Symmetry: D2
Subunit: 208 residues, 4 copies
């Protein structure tokens, strides 16, 4: 309607979400020794939509073809991340996990490429000391690869942060703590997921 | 779903409402001389649901019969308002209109009764000086009565505050400024109206 | 404060970190647990009883809170003024759920004891609680700085306690029960509103009505 | 700040007093008005151009804002880096609406002028603006404490100016145009976010994407 109107039941209404803060996560981990933790990349620690938007309009303006196009991946994984914007929620989590002496892992469904400069983009943006840093893991279901879940088990990752359903379920399938970050509403990756759909923790205000 | 989840498009989403504050209304009236203004009663200046809830379960537990039952009205209009809770938004508006030297009118669709102590309940709760106070007007469509709209025109009411659609349209039909107040979500008068449905001003936080 | 404060999208999306839950989530979390005792605070938890408290304030101590230790007030509040008290939908939903479960249902209130009380009847009637689930209201008092609820929750072996005030949640916590918060409506006369979620407790969504 | 801040229903329902509007409301408010000139700011109004600005910061002045008066930066920003700029849906909706109307569409930007610019092409392409509605981007500068937009809006007889920054709204107000606010996304690198609505101006709902 031209003027929908509203009411205070609607204005006050809350979805039943396990919201958490970075400070609550850290509190929850008080006294637990160094452990391995992992992050999804896209919309979790980098707003990488700039590179993906430019891939779609350079390589398949009318489809999602570009995501199976090696010319795109080679560009996305080798410097288009200089236009990716780091998420503040990720700065906060990564600083806290570095303070703990945790090992930091990035596990991505992006297609693998001959070389990648994503690892260095991350370590540089987030100031991750050498001793906490690990090369990006390209996970998936192509011949020769292992799944996200396998890599979590392989690396003994106890906490996995991610914005997509499959990040949470990959963690749950191996008994890790899967924590949800909100995808930004200006991402080009749509529809936005239903954060909290599995009763998982969701980080407040983690869209930026 | 057991865990609906949410996303930040939904968390940030706004209905396109002309929200206003009491301070903005007063600013809008800067330098305008004394004028007559009017208020709906129920859910506008009094949360009167306590009396109406007790009327429904005393007089028609299974219907809305009680609203045509004179035994109810006689009770509702003659002291059940001692359990009605005054709305803070109404305290703020009434104080400001008294400060302006405006005349205060209450125009109600409640059924008329032989006597009424509602006028005194209002003047007492809201501290309305004699010189600003006017006896409650019972408006409607029974033989001998005038409509809300007629009484607005008759009294030269230039601004009419109310929570129901018909308060806004009654004002609009006579060219008055109809300003919406939010019905509380715990009112027994349901469904809640769509505040802002006619592009009218709606007062922020006016549910209490 | 400023005439046109404006706002921004960080503020509009911002969420406090609260363990929000729904009645269905609570019911699921209890699936397969046999009958147990559970407990509810009354005022702003199951009944919007502000009508009677407001009337009492205005009748007996217009300029203060003395009415709340005035016996003549309590006698009115506990023997008919809850006829103006509006049942909360969250309470109807939770009480139906616990009856489904076969749980014993207690009401534990800091209202002062009176010679008679028709509050037990009002609650049983309003919420259609069967006799086997219903228990007489327990009137525990205030008494600063004691929580007069805790000992009742221990005595009745209450495993879940719903309430809108901080002391409802801490009473539960004192006894190892699961304290679950209901939001106090903004038009309550009991002010200021508590910070639901301030102990990391579950808070029921939309529970202000 | 506290580990479990909690919250309450006054806070959860609370609204700032903003003149929110929708594109449909704006279109209705213009029904029967003949073609006119209208204008848009670019950055965070029609394009999320933070990718290029972020890259520019990091390339040319990592520890400061000096890149924004560095010509080598502007030359990159205006000649290809908007290939990474993400069009805003609010902008697509508004620009389609103004084209429907037959309005002339201007882009007025405080980005610094460069020798060449492919920003006009990017916008025309991205938003499918026909040649008759499209106008070359107007690169006005910053220059504190001057608003370098106002004179352009007067020169082009722009009657509506959309923008996310306070100076977009005041430029409009300076010329008697109708200034309409778009929300800046919270993941913009241009911080802090402005207080949309702080001049009593219309603010477009959901306009952060
Ligand atoms: Co992702
Ligand atoms: Co009303
Ligand atoms: Co209570
Ligand atoms: Co801008
Ligand atoms: Os938790
Ligand atoms: Os990913
Ligand atoms: Os206005
Ligand atoms: Os009425
Ligand atoms: Os839970
Ligand atoms: Os109590
Ligand atoms: Os408007
Ligand atoms: Os600009």
């Amino acid at each position: 309607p031209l003027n929908p109107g509203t009411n205070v039941a609607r204005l006050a209404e809350q979805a039943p979400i396990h919201w958490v803060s970075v400070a609550q996560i850290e509190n929850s981990l008080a006294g637990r020794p160094p452990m391995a933790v992992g992050f999804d990349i896209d919309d979790t620690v980098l707003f990488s939509s700039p590179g993906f938007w430019r891939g779609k309009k350079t390589f398949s303006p009318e489809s999602e073809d570009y995501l199976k196009n090696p010319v795109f991946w080679e560009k996305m994984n080798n410097g288009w991340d200089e236009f990716s914007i780091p998420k503040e929620v990720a700065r906060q989590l990564i600083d806290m996990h570095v303070r703990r002496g945790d090992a930091i892992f990035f596990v991505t469904g992006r297609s693998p490429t001959k070389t990648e400069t994503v690892s260095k983009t991350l370590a540089d943006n987030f100031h991750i000391p050498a001793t906490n840093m690990n090369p990006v893991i390209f996970a998936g279901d192509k011949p020769g690869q292992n799944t996200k879940s396998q890599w979590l088990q392989d690396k003994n990752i106890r906490i996995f942060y991610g914005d997509s359903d499959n990040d949470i379920t990959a963690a749950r399938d191996v008994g890790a703590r899967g924590i949800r970050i909100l995808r930004a509403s200006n991402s080009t990756y749509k529809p936005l997921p239903q954060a909290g759909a599995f009763g998982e923790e969701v980080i407040v205000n983690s869209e930026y």
